[PDB]
Design a protein around this ligand. Structure first.
Ligand SMILES: CNc1ncc2cc(-c3ccc(-c4cccc(C)n4)cc3Cl)c(=O)n(C[C@H]3OC[C@H](N)CO3)c2n1
Length: 263
C-alpha cells in the first residue's frame, strides 16, 4: 500500500467496467508494462465504517496466490482516493455470459469445476469466499475462470446458517445456488422482495433445480443445497462429482461463450 507513488503517473485510467464494492472500477493500463489492469478508486472521505472492510479485503487478496483467484497487484493513496490495482479479466463475469441465452451443461460443469478449484484453494488455506455467485466469477479472454469480490467477514446466495449466524460449507451452499443461477439465469426466489427471502431461506426446504436438466446436474445442486452443512460435500469431493466428471471440458472452450457474448 504505497503512499509516495502517484497512481496517475503509473496507470492510465480507461473506461469504467462497472461499479464494484465501495467505488467505481475502471479498465486501466500499467504504463510500465502496458498490461491491462482493473482499477478500483475509492473515495475515503466518502467511506465511513467501510474503511476497515476495504483493508480486510486487501489483506485477504494479498495472501492469495492461485490461478483461480483474481490477482492483487497493490494499492495507492492519492489525496483522498484509494486506488486498488488488480488483474484485468477480459471475458467478463459468468453472469454477463448468461445474457445471450442459456448455457449448456458442458459450459455449466466447466465453470463449476473451475469455481471448485478456487474454493478448494481457499478452503485449504482456511479462507472462506463468502460471496460465491455468477457475478463474482470472472473469466479471462482465454476462458480461465477466477473468483473475485470476496464477501465481508443481498440474500439470494446466502446459506441458511449464515442468515441465522458457520464455515467453508457456506461456500458450498452458495455454489449450489450458483449452479442453479448458471442453469436458469437467476437464483431461487429472485422475483421476491429481499426481506421476504431473508426468512424463506431458513424456513423453507432447500431449493432444487427445476426443468429439463440432467439428473447428475440436479444431484450436484441437491448435494450442495442441504440445510445441514455437515451433509454438504467438500469442494475436493465435488470435483469428483459425476456431473463434473462427465460434463466438464477444457476451459479454452469457454472462449466460444465469450465471443457469443460479444456477438
Ligand atoms: C470485467 N473484468 C474485470 N476484471 C477484473 C476486475 C477486478 C475487480 C476488483 C475486485 C475487487 C477489488 C477490491 C480489492 C480489495 C478491496 C476492495 C474494496 N476491492 C478491486 C477490483 Cl479492481 C472489479 O471490480 N472488476 C469489476 C467487477 O464488477 C463487479 C463484479 N461483481 C465483478 O467484477 C473486475 N472486472
Amino acid at each position: 500500500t504505497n503512499l509516495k507513488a502517484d497512481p496517475e503517473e503509473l496507470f492510465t485510467k480507461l473506461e469504467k467496467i462497472g461499479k464494484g464494492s465501495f467505488g467505481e472500477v475502471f479498465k486501466g493500463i500499467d504504463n510500465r508494462t502496458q498490461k491491462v489492469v482493473a482499477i478500483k478508486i475509492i473515495d475515503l472521505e466518502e467511506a465511513e465504517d467501510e474503511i476497515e472492510d476495504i483493508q480486510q479485503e486487501i489483506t485477504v487478496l494479498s495472501q492469495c496466490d492461485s490461478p483461480y483467484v483474481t490477482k492483487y497487484y497493490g494499492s495507492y493513496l492519492k489525496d483522498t482516493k484509494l486506488w486498488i490495482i488488480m488483474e484485468y479479466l477480459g471475458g467478463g463475469s459468468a453472469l454477463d455470459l448468461l445474457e445471450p441465452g442459456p448455457l449448456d451443461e458442458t459450459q455449466i460443469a466447466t465453470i463449476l469445476r473451475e469455481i471448485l478449484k478456487g474454493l478448494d484453494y481457499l478452503h485449504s488455506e482456511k479462507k472462506i469466499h463468502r460471496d460465491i455467485k455468477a457475478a463474482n466469477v470472472l473469466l479471462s479472454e482465454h476462458g480461465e475462470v477466477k473468483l473475485a469480490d470476496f464477501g465481508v467477514a443481498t440474500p439470494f446466495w446466502m446459506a441458511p446458517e449464515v442468515i441465522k449466524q458457520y464455515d467453508s460449507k457456506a461456500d458450498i451452499w452458495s455454489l449450489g445456488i450458483t449452479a442453479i443461477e448458471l442453469a436458469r439465469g437467476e437464483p431461487p426466489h429472485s422475483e421476491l422482495h429481499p426481506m421476504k427471502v431473508l426468512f424463506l431461506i431458513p424456513k423453507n426446504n432447500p431449493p432444487t433445480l427445476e426443468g429439463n436438466y440432467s439428473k447428475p446436474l440436479k444431484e450436484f445442486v441437491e448435494a450442495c443445497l442441504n440445510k445441514e452443512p455437515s451433509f454438504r460435500p467438500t469442494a475436493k469431493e465435488l470435483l469428483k462429482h459425476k456431473f463434473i466428471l462427465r460434463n466438464a471440458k477444457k476451459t479454452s472452450y469457454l472462449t466460444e461463450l465469450i465471443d457469443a457474448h460479444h456477438h
